[model samples]
Target: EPARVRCSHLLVKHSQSRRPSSWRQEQITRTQEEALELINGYIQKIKSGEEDFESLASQFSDCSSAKARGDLGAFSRGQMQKPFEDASFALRTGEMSGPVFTDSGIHIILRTE
Candidate 1:
């Protein structure tokens, strides 16, 4: 089998500037509390397999990779974004993690170990 890896995730409000189709600041959120709630909800969707990583990301991510489908690409540990890297390297394969906090908000992370 291939080597294992830790994968963490954080979800935040996707504002207008991130994606044209993103939710407006006024639509589903107004404060960090609201952003946290919405982000947590999406994270749950991802953990339950009701969410598609790339598709949901395309529709919901706030980062540039949102267009590339939230594909953190190939990561072996230190290669990923700090918060994501730390969390990702901490899991066992098939494990699900987070709704954990970060500058962005919350996330549901899965792993392969």
Candidate 2:
């Protein structure tokens, strides 16, 4: 089957753990909330098709893909991160999906396949 999916993911550039000496430790819960909120924010943009995915991911993601146009190109069902693959494969092409949790952070995905 031929398919194409329009997807937007928010990868919060978060550290694995905040150091006890780091001031961020005191704000862990709120920081996590920010990640969730950021994904929701991206979902809004994707649904509206007003998103510049590359720019958004570059400014947000902690991963290298964020620098590469936000295009997780031509991936199979199992190739992507679990959270990402599960969400994308569940949708029909052209459908907007996600605001799902993943290893990097929360993501907003739209599968056009």
Candidate 3:
């Protein structure tokens, strides 16, 4: 197993999120269900090759990492929330995960390295 992993993730923040605000909007009013729907649409686009992950993340992800095309750099086990960390560690390089739920919101994680 690798001691550290590099990942990129697209996050969609909802009203239930720990901090329900994002760079795209000062007030995140969407419900978790709505956010899930939106993220799933992005996932489909990526899966079908209709869109690339980096560009979609830059345009739609709520996280600050969107500025860097969702790149979160490299991190060890303890650096992230349990769900995000576990999902990131489980994927092989170049693999992308399905929806992952966390207090921050829903995420589509791409294991880059």
Candidate 4:
């Protein structure tokens, strides 16, 4: 319990509700897929040195913490949502974790500490 970890994240909240058999819902579904692809592209850009983690996270994350460049501050295991904690703790410091899906949606974590 002594461990505390820090990271920046890029979050894309899940798509809107999809009512059964509605064309609007279909459009929403398609948009969500596009958003997923776009987020993936952001990952590649960061990995390739075309973008900075903090900058992108700050600009695009849906979380309120995005204002702080997505800094998730030091937190202990079990303090976060299960899926978020799993992905956060699994990374080595300075590593960029792939998109992690949770009830809240998808998150791209950049393990900063």
Best by TM-score: 3
* Each model's lDDT: 0.55, 0.57, 0.96, 0.74
- Which digits, one per residue and each the tens of the lDDT, describe model 4 over residues 1-113? 23878878887664542221221123223355665786899899998999988898778676667888889798988788888898888888888888787755577898888
TM-scores for every predicted model: 0.59, 0.61, 0.98, 0.80
Point out where model 2 deviates above 4 Å.
1-8, 13-30, 45-50
**Candidate 3 error regions (>4 Å):** none
| Number of backbone clashes in candidate 4 | 0
Candidate numbers, best lDDT first, in rank order: 3, 4, 2, 1
RMSD of each: 5.3, 5.7, 0.6, 5.6
Task: Judging by lDDT, tell me the better candidate of 3 and 4.
Answer: 3
What is the C-alpha local distance difference test score of candidate 3?
Answer: 0.96
Higher-ranked by lDDT: 2 or 4: 4
Which pairs of residues have clashing backbones in candidate 2? 5-112, 93-112, 93-113, 94-112
Local accuracy of candidate 1 as per-residue lDDT tens digits, 6-112:
34343564332222233323442435566667777776777688976657766765544566555444476445557766667666776766655554445556564
Q: Give the TM-score of candidate 2.
A: 0.61
Q: Report the poorest 10 consecutive residues by lDDT, candidate 4.
A: 17-26
Query: Per-residue lDDT tens digits of candidate 3, residues 39-111?
Result: 9999999999999999999999999999999999999998899999999999999999999999999999999
